[PDB]
Amino acid sequence: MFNSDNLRLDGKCAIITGAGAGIGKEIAITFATAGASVVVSDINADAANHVVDEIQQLGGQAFACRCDITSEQELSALADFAISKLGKVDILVNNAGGGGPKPFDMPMADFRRAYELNVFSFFHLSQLVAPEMEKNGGGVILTITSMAAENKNINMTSYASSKAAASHLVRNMAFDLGEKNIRVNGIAPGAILTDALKSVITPEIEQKMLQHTPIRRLGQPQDIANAALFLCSPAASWVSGQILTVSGGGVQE
Amino acid sequence: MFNSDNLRLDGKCAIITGAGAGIGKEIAITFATAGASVVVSDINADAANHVVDEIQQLGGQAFACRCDITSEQELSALADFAISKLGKVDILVNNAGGGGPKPFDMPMADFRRAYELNVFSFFHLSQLVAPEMEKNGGGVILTITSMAAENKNINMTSYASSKAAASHLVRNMAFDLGEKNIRVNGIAPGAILTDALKSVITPEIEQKMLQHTPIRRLGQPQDIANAALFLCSPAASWVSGQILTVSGGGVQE
Amino acid sequence: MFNSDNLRLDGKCAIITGAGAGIGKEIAITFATAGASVVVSDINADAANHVVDEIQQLGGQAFACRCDITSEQELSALADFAISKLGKVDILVNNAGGGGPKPFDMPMADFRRAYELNVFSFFHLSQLVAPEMEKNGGGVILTITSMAAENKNINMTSYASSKAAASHLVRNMAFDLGEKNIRVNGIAPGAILTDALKSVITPEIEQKMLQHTPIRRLGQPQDIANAALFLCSPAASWVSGQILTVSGGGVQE
Amino acid sequence: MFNSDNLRLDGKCAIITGAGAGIGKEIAITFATAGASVVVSDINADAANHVVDEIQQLGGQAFACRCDITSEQELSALADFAISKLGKVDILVNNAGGGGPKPFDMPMADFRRAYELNVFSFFHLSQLVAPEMEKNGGGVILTITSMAAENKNINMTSYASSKAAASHLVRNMAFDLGEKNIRVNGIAPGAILTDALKSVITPEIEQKMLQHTPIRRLGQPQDIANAALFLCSPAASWVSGQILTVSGGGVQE
């Protein structure tokens, strides 16, 4: 039978990478509003700090930490800081990442970078928290991937190849971590109208993207926040190694 | 921000196939307990009625109809009964259907039958309830597919191909019905310990299926009911054409 | 090292369903030209018969047989006739099939039909030849599926769902038949400019379809004939359970 | 109509990574024997040179270069040597690369390295030879990926994710290079019995891997060389962005 408390994160401690803005910001707020203590990580400290007061204005407890996910040194620091501020780590939502469409002849530096963001940082950070989660008898890791991980188009070599790596790592990491009773899942956002896109997108552009979405509307960060909550909640206790695409049933071009 | 009402089905009217036992019974009870009025359908009216009684005891509203999904006549009869008893239809949970390991040399009757159970039935009923969902302004159709739809093995020709047909039906159907604000999704459950297997299973046999499952415990009907709720709740309003697997990150032989 | 005879069908006997025209016609000719005796099956006898003289004009030996693949009675007849005319059956290429885009509210008859063509006939015919192939110690089954089996778009419910069933049957049948030392593979044609499309397609239409194909050109039946030869040849002796998409790297819309 | 010349590489110039042994060596010999001039590259010049000698003995033209694919400098040096010795480049067979089972707690050095071996190397070399292929009017790049790219298991985080990255690189890269008439494909080989394993394997161990393979025999290097030939031969001129698995229809543990 239905049980609302299974849909909440009461007493949980979560790290949310790149949560100073966009989808990441919504996950942080939505998680704190469901009962979990949160460490809001982001390179843009001022942004991270805004999210924190914003959570307190709601009564949740958040802490800010600047952290370049691409710096191994900052990742271990993020981890030590999180275990000190919250006392433990139950949830890790690896949101930060990116890269973008690029020509085939981008310098290798551009190529290597997508991996730092989408693959290596994600993997190093899990290695850091995994021991903590295993100490407490379990935990949940959630990464935000992308639909590029499953589509193919021009100028997507690095971004698409990296996101694919991350999605497949999820499927395998689910096995290594499963022993430590840690679930690992991912979510592939469609065209999320994060405030950034929201500012540029022309009503003509919108129609062009929504041209192939059955549920004719652009996504909102919340859509991704709802999916994350479910996947990180106890209601999803036997769900591991999955990638949930949240994109209205189609693809935005 | 976290909104608990988005995770409830207040005033939603759901039809649920094969709800006398196992997975369907639990989705019926979880749904009804989350605020929706439900029609419990089943080839076993005794079972359906018991489930209805039990739902009412918990203070939920529910109605029972003995329906054999392999009958076109009986499928229309199910739709009329729901229109008649609930007044409208917002959610269809196509749970019944089946088939299992069959010799390559099985009689064609047996082969086609797996299609009756998982494909033709599911599609027709969708045709029946679609027109009713659109007049309410939207809806959610959800199927209980299978991991056989994604796996490969011996003695699975009928069973696995039909579940594969059903799973790709979800993806395509999401396009057609997307213009009528209807979302279509499915769930691929692993080895779920339903009251039947619960007594056919022996602790020995168990350590074998679980041999390749990261989250080392067999599934409970609640796990599936939990994902169906989310997938049919307004919180997953931009999730369509997806097939979520709940198997603890592995495959139970 | 390279060995041309491994790329030929010398001494092989092949059944080619729906070979009176299109892709099917090319497979027949290309196979006979590589050394195999062929039974050219098709509902349009005159077409089947043309292909046969055409093969003889090249020195290959073909035999015609009218056969509605959707009639169980005609399938067993096709089989008995093939084993009588050729002496044995080494290769089965299940080309005939079809169905097409259809609205969600097509009558059920339309839905059931796609399955007769794409799934049931294919499965019944394999059941019929499998015993013959097993007698000779091996064989090869090849089905022509479609890209609909992997894409999702509006008005594709039946066609797409059926082709998906067929592709997944390939993956599983590979296990049942593997014991009988029979390989089973499929090929998913992209937009093949079969003489039919070739007659209607406007130079403007062409551009529209080729809009998303990296190798900017429409396919030719031969392209599919080359793939089939490889997959049915000894060079592909450890290749089973595969679906090869031949579509220039993209999709034609 | 069957055309044997389409299945040959006469006057084609191919570069082949890790061609001193196993799979690469055989693709080198099969290619050279099918009419193309080949550059045999390898971190082991002794091995490369022996393979070159052996090729010449069979009357084919070949050249050897000791190249360590993990070096950007050495990759450019390989491209110059091929341009210098063969005059042009029409085919690139990226065979080397690797990595294997690694503990979740592996050092990041080991993790990144799997990316050096299967991702970064493969991409860069593609960048190097692309410009040369387009000036000849076309080309074919082909990678030796892995079944780990599609599977899930314990102790495969690095190995499997990098092969997944490489496999999705094929799909996307096919778009970019498609405008320059360059086709990109890959092959996922199963358990191939190469001269090394050939002596490390014990008849006991063999009956175990083969336990779930329909075509019950381990793969031979020829099987892979056979598919690479076809995939690089003009006969597969409309096949791009594909990843063919050669594993006898199953998975060898």
Ligand SMILES: NC(=O)c1ccc[n+]([C@@H]2O[C@H](COP(=O)([O-])OP(=O)(O)OC[C@H]3O[C@@H](n4cnc5c(N)ncnc54)[C@H](O)[C@@H]3O)[C@@H](O)[C@H]2O)c1
């Ligand atoms: N918005 C979309 O439409 C969309 C679609 C598909 C996938 N995604 C994925 O979702 C994730 C988040 O995307 P978003 O759209 O919210 O992005 P965004 O760039 O708007 O926000 C990223 C947040 O992370 C911060 N950040 C950037 N680099 C960082 C670093 N190196 N270390 C720590 N923090 C850093 C930014 O300041 C920002 O607050 C990414 O992994 C992205 O690949 C987004």
Ligand SMILES: NC(=O)c1ccc[n+]([C@@H]2O[C@H](COP(=O)([O-])OP(=O)(O)OC[C@H]3O[C@@H](n4cnc5c(N)ncnc54)[C@H](O)[C@@H]3O)[C@@H](O)[C@H]2O)c1
């Ligand atoms: N339980 C598992 O481990 C598992 C795993 C994978 C897929 N599934 C899927 O879940 C669904 C239910 O499986 P389950 O094991 O919970 O089922 P079950 O055998 O318990 O059947 C559930 C209910 O359906 C009823 N029913 C059977 N045939 C019917 C018909 N023809 N018309 C109407 N009602 C009918 C049964 O009497 C029962 O009350 C199926 O779609 C099955 O493929 C279950």
Ligand SMILES: NC(=O)c1ccc[n+]([C@@H]2O[C@H](COP(=O)([O-])OP(=O)(O)OC[C@H]3O[C@@H](n4cnc5c(N)ncnc54)[C@H](O)[C@@H]3O)[C@@H](O)[C@H]2O)c1
């Ligand atoms: N042409 C394309 O672009 C394309 C694309 C994707 C998939 N396909 C698939 O390829 C296969 C063959 O397609 P095609 O394009 O050559 O088709 P087609 O309709 O041009 O030719 C089919 C041939 O089979 C015959 N046929 C029709 N029904 C038959 C039946 N019931 N029994 C026996 N023979 C019958 C027809 O007379 C004809 O000679 C089909 O399974 C189709 O789904 C084709």
Ligand SMILES: NC(=O)c1ccc[n+]([C@@H]2O[C@H](COP(=O)([O-])OP(=O)(O)OC[C@H]3O[C@@H](n4cnc5c(N)ncnc54)[C@H](O)[C@@H]3O)[C@@H](O)[C@H]2O)c1
């Ligand atoms: N053999 C199998 O069962 C199998 C299965 C799956 C994938 N593969 C793939 O096939 C490819 C070759 O595998 P294999 O077992 O045949 O390989 P292998 O270990 O025999 O290596 C082949 C050649 O590559 C050379 N080489 C190694 N590192 C190199 C480097 N850094 N730079 C240049 N040359 C180098 C080796 O010395 C050897 O001569 C790899 O991509 C591997 O992932 C093989």
